[PDB]
Ligand binder design. Structure first.
Ligand SMILES: *[C@@H]1O[C@H](CO)[C@@H](O[C@@H]2O[C@H](CO)[C@@H](O[C@@H]3O[C@H](CO)[C@@H](O)[C@H](O)[C@@H]3O)[C@H](O)[C@H]2NC(C)=O)[C@H](O)[C@H]1NC(C)=O
Ligand SMILES: *[C@@H]1O[C@H](CO)[C@@H](O[C@@H]2O[C@H](CO)[C@@H](O[C@@H]3O[C@H](CO)[C@@H](O)[C@H](O)[C@@H]3O)[C@H](O)[C@H]2NC(C)=O)[C@H](O)[C@H]1NC(C)=O
Ligand SMILES: *[C@@H]1O[C@H](CO)[C@@H](O[C@@H]2O[C@H](CO)[C@@H](O[C@@H]3O[C@H](CO)[C@@H](O)[C@H](O)[C@@H]3O)[C@H](O)[C@H]2NC(C)=O)[C@H](O)[C@H]1NC(C)=O
Ligand SMILES: *[C@@H]1O[C@H](CO)[C@@H](O[C@@H]2O[C@H](CO)[C@@H](O)[C@H](O)[C@H]2NC(C)=O)[C@H](O)[C@H]1NC(C)=O
Ligand SMILES: *[C@@H]1O[C@H](CO)[C@@H](O)[C@H](O)[C@H]1NC(C)=O
Lengths: 232, 116, 194
């Protein structure tokens, strides 16, 4: 590892779908860890480890792709099991291992000697891998910055839940007025004790942050099933 | 699939110095231990040289025996000096290596050296 | 469907002294193969009933493969002071793991003899449950230690299996895989086929 030498009025963002079974045209209330309306949560873009307090909301407004994944571990020390999420355009892999991470988190990218083929294989995230308990190969998922990638992570009851959605809006304005209905992507049964979280990016060698809060919210379902309106 | 190739084994006179190189052809994750064993006339399965952590050799030949463990070239070297007819033996390789297919122990075909 | 069958169909198994451990998770486990007998010898499967295994759910399963003479197959059991337990491979006092043993004398044995495998029979102390011991350090049956593993004073702990084809069932080598099962607060990876 080669070591190298903001909040907006937050209303109607990332309410995830609580249940997968189909429902239609009804006003339902559920009390669960949710992001409050007008919560004024923070926005990121220069990346410190952020403590995982509750479930976490996250957003990506930029059109181009630079996000290479995230880092999930209680401490930099190896002893604590670590969830290395891997978001590489070639491969997206959930790897859970007893990781001793390097001082600087960024991974490394370079082109080939004679082919000049830009290889992102080299990693500079963890110094060592002590005990690697888990491996999963998931589906590799991806000027006005139209697209919006919105995510929620929820780690309770030995279950780690990934709530994911994406929608483009040509508006460059940072936070759209319109409602955000969010679908669960993956579930992990690892249940590793996670007290802190960091992003992960690559290096040549725009990031809403909110915490779920316990409160009951009312949802009106569409005939199709979408969350047309969400209220306090 | 680690393959052990023995080199340097030849028929020699008593008192000579010989080296056996046990090259590991197959790829490896990491090596725990590699142990030499003797088939000598009038001698059973016995421990030539290896570890025990710190390097260990056999009785009455501990000084004669020399272990060169090389983790870069993946070839271990055994040097036996001041040879005697009792040292006429097939020196069987035995490498305990965890590799791509998995943790395994592999036995080298061995080479016979005749001393008289 | 994680490859529970590949260990049954692995080319060659590990030695007694050094046992390879494979852990299977994030997969559905099938006990249908274990419903069929491994060989003419019926496997001894401790803890839960073999017929009930499909209903079981284990947080993690640990598989160990090794070849042992037919005489000592009865020796392996939860927590008994034995040569394999004390020096080769120790199993906790009360364990629910499942042992699968199938005769392999035909494939394994060699007329010239295959010494690919050794056992440890010598140690000053006791073996904890589930710690592979690869130590080759000098052993002293006599009280006085020696340096350089002198024969009459110091006796080497490891001795090989000849595996000459022998009619005696005790000497006949069986390939044996043990399945350690453990449960904790984490959800169980094992799932039923139906
Ligand atoms: C970004 O860099 C490279 C880009 O290809 C990725 O390397 C891939 O990493 C995966 C997971 O570590 C590996 O694939 C695995 O291959 C084994 C056989 O060796 C097989 O069981 C599976 O097919 C499994 O996916 C492999 O190292 C490599 N795969 C390929 C196709 O290149 C890398 O993981 C990406 N991410 C990071 C953080 O570097
Ligand atoms: C996570 O990895 C660590 C790596 O240090 C494991 O700790 C030790 O790992 C070594 C691996 O060789 C083992 O110790 C070995 O066997 C005995 C144990 O008393 C002893 O002669 C030496 O310590 C020898 O190195 C053993 O697995 C473990 N030992 C202890 C005392 O913890 C750790 O177990 C791993 N955690 C897991 C797999 O949950
Ligand atoms: C709830 O949503 C589902 C989504 O599948 C509705 O089913 C039908 O979905 C297709 C696929 O887009 C619609 O085709 C499109 O219709 C629009 C409007 O006419 C047209 O402009 C497009 O070119 C395309 O043909 C289809 O219209 C839609 N069905 C109907 C009756 O509109 C499902 O019907 C929805 N249920 C309700 C009524 O809430
Ligand atoms: C793997 O080895 C076994 C050993 O006999 C082969 O036969 C299987 O034996 C198990 C014993 O429990 C039975 O449950 C299976 O039904 C047997 N399989 C058959 C008869 O096809 C098995 O065929 C081998 N598998 C491979 C892929 O070679
Ligand atoms: C998780 O780690 C924190 C930090 O040491 C600790 O306070 C907490 O008790 C741990 N919880 C579990 C379930 O391990």
């Amino acid at each position: 590892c080669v070591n190298l030498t903001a909040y907006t009025n937050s209303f109607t963002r990332g309410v995830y779908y609580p249940d997968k079974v189909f429902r239609s045209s009804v006003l339902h209330s559920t009390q669960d860890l949710f992001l409050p309306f007008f919560s004024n949560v923070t926005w990121f873009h220069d990346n410190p480890v952020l403590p995982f307090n509750d479930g976490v909301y996250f957003a990506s407004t930029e059109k181009s792709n630079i996000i290479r994944g995230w880092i999930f571990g209680t401490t930099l020390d190896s002893k604590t099991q670590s969830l290395l999420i891997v978001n590489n355009a070639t491969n997206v892999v959930i790897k859970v291992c007893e990781f001793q991470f390097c001082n600087d988190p960024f991974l490394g990218v370079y082109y080939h000697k004679n082919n000049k083929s830009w290889m992102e294989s080299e990693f500079r995230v963890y110094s060592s891998a002590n005990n690697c308990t888990f491996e999963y190969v998931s589906q590799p998922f991806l000027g006005n910055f139209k697209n919006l990638r919105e995510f929620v992570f929820k780690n309770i009851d030995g279950y780690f839940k990934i709530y994911s959605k994406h929608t483009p809006i040509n508006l460059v304005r940072d936070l759209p007025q319109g409602f955000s209905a969010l679908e669960p992507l993956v579930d992990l049964p690892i249940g590793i004790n996670i007290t802190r979280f960091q992003t992960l990016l690559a290096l040549h060698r725009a990031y809403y942050v909110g915490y779920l809060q316990p409160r009951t919210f009312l949802l009106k379902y569409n005939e199709n099933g979408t969350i047309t309106d969400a209220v306090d | 699939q680690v393959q052990l190739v023995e080199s340097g084994g030849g028929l020699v006179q008593p008192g000579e110095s010989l080296r056996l190189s046990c090259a590991a052809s197959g790829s490896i994750f990491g090596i725990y231990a590699v142990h030499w064993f003797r088939m000598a006339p009038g001698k059973e399965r016995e421990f030539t040289a290896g570890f025990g952590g710190s390097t260990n050799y056999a009785a009455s030949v501990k000084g004669r025996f020399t272990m060169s463990r090389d983790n870069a070239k993946n070839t271990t070297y055994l040097q036996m000096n001041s040879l005697k007819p009792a040292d006429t033996a097939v020196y069987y390789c035995h490498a305990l290596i965890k590799n791509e297919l998995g943790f395994l122990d592999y036995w080298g075909p061995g080479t016979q050296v005749t001393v008289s």
